[PDB]
Amino acid sequence: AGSIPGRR
Amino acid sequence: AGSIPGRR
Amino acid sequence: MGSMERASLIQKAKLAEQAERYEDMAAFMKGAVEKGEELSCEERNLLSVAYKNVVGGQRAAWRVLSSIEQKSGPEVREYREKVETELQGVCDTVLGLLDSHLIKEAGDAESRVFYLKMKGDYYRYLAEVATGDDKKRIIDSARSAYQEAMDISKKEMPPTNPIRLGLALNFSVFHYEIANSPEEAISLAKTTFDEAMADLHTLSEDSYKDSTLIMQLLRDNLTLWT
Amino acid sequence: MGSMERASLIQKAKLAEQAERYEDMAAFMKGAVEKGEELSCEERNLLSVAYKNVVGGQRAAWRVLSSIEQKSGPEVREYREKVETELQGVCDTVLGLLDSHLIKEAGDAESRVFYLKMKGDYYRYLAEVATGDDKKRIIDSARSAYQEAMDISKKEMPPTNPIRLGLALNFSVFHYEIANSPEEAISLAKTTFDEAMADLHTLSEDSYKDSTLIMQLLRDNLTLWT
Ligand SMILES: *Cc1ccc(C(=O)N2CCC(CCO)CC2)cc1
Ligand SMILES: *Cc1ccc(C(=O)N2CCC(CCO)CC2)cc1
Ligand SMILES: [Ca+2]
Ligand SMILES: [Ca+2]
Ligand SMILES: [Cl-]
Ligand SMILES: [Cl-]
Ligand SMILES: [Cl-]
Ligand SMILES: [Cl-]
Numbered sequence: 216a217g218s219i220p221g222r223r
Numbered sequence: 224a225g226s227i228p229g230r231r
Numbered sequence: 232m233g234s235m236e237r238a239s240l241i242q243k244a245k246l247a248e249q250a251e252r253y254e255d256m257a258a259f260m261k262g263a264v265e266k267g268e269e270l271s272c273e274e275r276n277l278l279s280v281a282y283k284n285v286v287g288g289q290r291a292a293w294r295v296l297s298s299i300e301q302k303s304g305p306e307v308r309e310y311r312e313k314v315e316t317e318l319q320g321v322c323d324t325v326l327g328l329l330d331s332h333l334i335k336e337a338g339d340a341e342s343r344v345f346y347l348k349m350k351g352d353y354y355r356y357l358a359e360v361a362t363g364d365d366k367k368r369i370i371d372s373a374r375s376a377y378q379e380a381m382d383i384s385k386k387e388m389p390p391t392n393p394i395r396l397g398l399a400l401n402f403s404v405f406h407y408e409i410a411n412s413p414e415e416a417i418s419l420a421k422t423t424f425d426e427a428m429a430d431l432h433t434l435s436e437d438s439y440k441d442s443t444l445i446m447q448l449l450r451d452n453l454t455l456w457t
Numbered sequence: 458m459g460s461m462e463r464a465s466l467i468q469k470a471k472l473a474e475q476a477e478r479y480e481d482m483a484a485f486m487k488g489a490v491e492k493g494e495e496l497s498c499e500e501r502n503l504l505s506v507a508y509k510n511v512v513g514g515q516r517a518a519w520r521v522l523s524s525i526e527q528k529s530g531p532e533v534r535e536y537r538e539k540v541e542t543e544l545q546g547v548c549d550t551v552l553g554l555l556d557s558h559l560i561k562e563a564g565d566a567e568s569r570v571f572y573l574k575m576k577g578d579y580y581r582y583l584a585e586v587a588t589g590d591d592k593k594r595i596i597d598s599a600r601s602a603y604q605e606a607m608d609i610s611k612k613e614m615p616p617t618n619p620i621r622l623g624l625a626l627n628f629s630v631f632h633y634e635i636a637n638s639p640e641e642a643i644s645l646a647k648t649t650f651d652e653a654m655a656d657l658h659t660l661s662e663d664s665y666k667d668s669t670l671i672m673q674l675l676r677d678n679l680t681l682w683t
Binding site for chain 3: 465514517518533535
């Protein structure tokens with residue numbers, strides 16, 4: 216289950 | 224120029 | 232960081248991100264917040280990205296050690312407790328910045344939803360490692376922060392707004408992973424995806440890209456959950 | 458780490474590697490060395506891997522900032538100086554462990570060549586960032602450490618020994634990147650590769666794999682340099 220990815 | 228890679 | 236200029240802290244936080252020095256980036260942005268001034272949209276992103284990276288590495292290390300601990304001297308439990316305590320300190324630090332005094336001074340919907348989403352995220356991270364007499368109160372603190380941000384975002388933001396979409400995505404993960412409510416998780420992700428789909432026709436090509444990227448993350452979770 | 462058992466420090470250093478917590482791993486192995494006892498072959502690898510990871514991230518961040526600095530307020534130079542100072546502190550810490558008292562107590566060829574190779578590596582890392590009145594003396598300190606390790610390895614180790622091969626590889630990189638001696642670098646890598654090739658027939662399948670892996674690294678550099 217993926218949350219908003221941290222970095223960019 | 225590659226040295227010995229650090230981790231494994 | 233009290234002796235460094237606000238602009239220099241922001242300047243060095245962007246340099247730290249380029250160098251992938253996320254602990255430095257978080258310390259710079261912590262000093263920028265403690266100057267007492269509200270954060271711009273870009274500055275809010277710098278704060279979020281910095282601490283999300285730092286706590287992300289801590290969570291990954293915690294899960295490695297907790298898995299070894301469960302498979303199994305006191306060394307494994309001691310070191311897991313060590314990483315767990317440092318993770319809780321970072322979460323407490325972010326929650327302290329939001330409480331002093333980012334949230335109370337956030338009047339716009341964009342800023343207030345952003346900070347309340349952060350508050351739910353870092354209470355969710357505390358909930359991932361909690362086992363004692365506070366576990367339920369920590370879970371409710373995450374739910375309460377997410378719910379207030381959800382209420383404002385539904386009233387004040389279009390269904391395609393990236394912050395609104397990311398909020399619903401993380402709140403859905405909270406329902407699935409923390410609150411033991413997989414049906415609530417699936418319903419929120421599905422309703423969020425469908426209402427954003429119907430609003431895509433109003434967007435420019437650049438905003439279209441921003442929204443559909445997060446919509447695919449919702450789709451990924453739905454495929455995993457159904 | 459003076460209050461923790463030697464075995465617990467070694468135990469937790471292996472856990473830190475699994476969790477990719479390399480600063481913790483280095484601190485654990487620093488405490489293990491400071492117990493005063495010599496290191497086993499495996500323990501020497503734990504020490505080397507820990508600090509090579511920590512300084513590796515510092516070097517990568519230094520090169521990002523130094524590139525931005527060269528493209529170009531004082532923020533970029535200040536932050537580069539900050540990372541550079543912390544990199545030099547880690548290198549000084551490793552060199553202090555080798556000098557107190559790992560090297561003087563290393564009598565076997567395997568241990569002594571290993572520590573002297575480390576000494577050349579961390580003086581080479583100091584040389585990468587040096588610009589002042591010490592730059593030449595730091596370069597000579599790296600050359601002297603590499604040369605002593607080379608002399609012992611040629612006398613005491615077969616040409617296929619992984620430590621001997623890795624020593625020659627890193628010494629060749631020193632010649633190319635630090636000493637401005639690309640012809641010396643190419644000659645050492647070529648002679649090392651050829652003499653290891655002629656000794657492969659003596660090895661088992663597992664030792665064959667160990668040696669040919671490092672031989673390919675020498676081949677990669679030769680392809681890049683010729
Ligand atoms: C809560 C939140 C954060 C970020 C976005 C967003 O616009 N994303 C996801 C990651 C981002 C890089 C970090 O800024 C790129 C696209 C939405 C919601
Ligand atoms: C100086 C040195 C170090 C390590 C080797 C070696 O056997 N290698 C390269 C990296 C290693 C993982 C770290 O132990 C795997 C193969 C040779 C020479
Ligand atoms: Ca000022
Ligand atoms: Ca003891
Ligand atoms: Cl510990
Ligand atoms: Cl305001
Ligand atoms: Cl700085
Ligand atoms: Cl001895």
